[PDB]
Design a protein around this ligand. Structure first.
Ligand SMILES: *C(=O)N1C[C@H](NOS(=O)(=O)O)CC[C@H]1C(N)=O
Length: 250
């Protein structure tokens, strides 16, 4: 466990980062207190909910559809019978809500327990209804489920090193749709952003979680902001993560 200083890449935004290489058990931590604090995963939960849907047969491949019903949404890409790959990349809430609501709560509880997914608290299945957004909510969106950045990395490592019971074919579908382009062919980066606002504490929950493969070694990472500036989003923290990767992990 090496404490590191990545502040220069955070451009004055408050947050922290953790990178773990499981071959040599090298844990690099910036802002240890934040890295151990549990927070709502927001859209980073799509990493796990995709695997749940695959395991239960609700979806089967990166082409799988969830039967769009014609409901009007402001994001033009949500207004179609989109595939799993497009729903993941466009963060289509209705698709992932419909997916999870086809799965019984016991099954979800047991999968989260097996993954040690933070507090594994799905008690508020419907999510944070007081925000007025009705069915666009759920337990993983600023609600009962909370996970620390360190626990995110531990979960990613267990999934993608083959240490869970999820099928290898399903893990590879996730890998496929998580891959991003960082304009550097010499590193493979995979990840997912998440964005929420913590109304109790008036701070953002802005995430980028994933992995990086660079010539033999693999690092699992979580970058997290808790800034009070509402302009700080998941996509903003992904930019910060990319800067760290290129500066320190290239
Ligand atoms: C997940 O965090 N969400 C879904 C959607 N996309 O998030 S992302 O841009 O961070 O990937 C919008 C934000 C958030 C939500 N409001 O549900």
């Amino acid at each position: 466990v090496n404490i590191v200083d990545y502040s220069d890449c955070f451009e004055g935004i408050s947050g922290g980062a953790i990178f773990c290489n499981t071959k040599n058990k090298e844990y690099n931590i910036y802002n240890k207190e934040l890295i151990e604090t549990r927070r709502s995963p927001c859209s980073t939960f799509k990493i796990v909910s995709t695997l749940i849907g695959l395991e239960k047969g609700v979806i089967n491949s990166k082409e799988s559809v969830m039967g769009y019903d014609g409901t009007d949404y402001p994001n033009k890409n949500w207004n179609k019978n989109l595939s799993l790959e497009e729903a993941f990349k466009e963060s289509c809430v209705w698709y992932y809500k419909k997916l999870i609501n086809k799965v019984d709560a016991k099954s979800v509880q047991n999968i989260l327990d097996d993954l040690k997914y933070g507090n594994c608290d799905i008690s508020e299945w419907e999510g944070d209804l007081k925000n007025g957004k009705g069915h666009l909510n759920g337990f993983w969106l600023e609600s009962s489920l909370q996970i620390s950045p360190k626990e995110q990395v531990q979960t990613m490592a267990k999934i993608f090193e083959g240490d869970t019971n999820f099928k290898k074919e399903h893990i590879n579908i996730l890998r496929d749709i998580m891959a991003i382009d960082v304009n550097d062919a010499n590193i493979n980066v995979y990840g997912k952003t998440g964005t929420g606002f913590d109304e109790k504490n008036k701070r953002v929950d802005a995430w980028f979680v994933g992995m990086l493969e660079r010539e033999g070694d693999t690092y699992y990472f979580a970058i997290k902001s808790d800034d009070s500036n509402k302009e700080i989003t998941g996509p903003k923290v992904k930019e910060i993560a990319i800067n760290i990767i290129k500066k320190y992990y290239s």
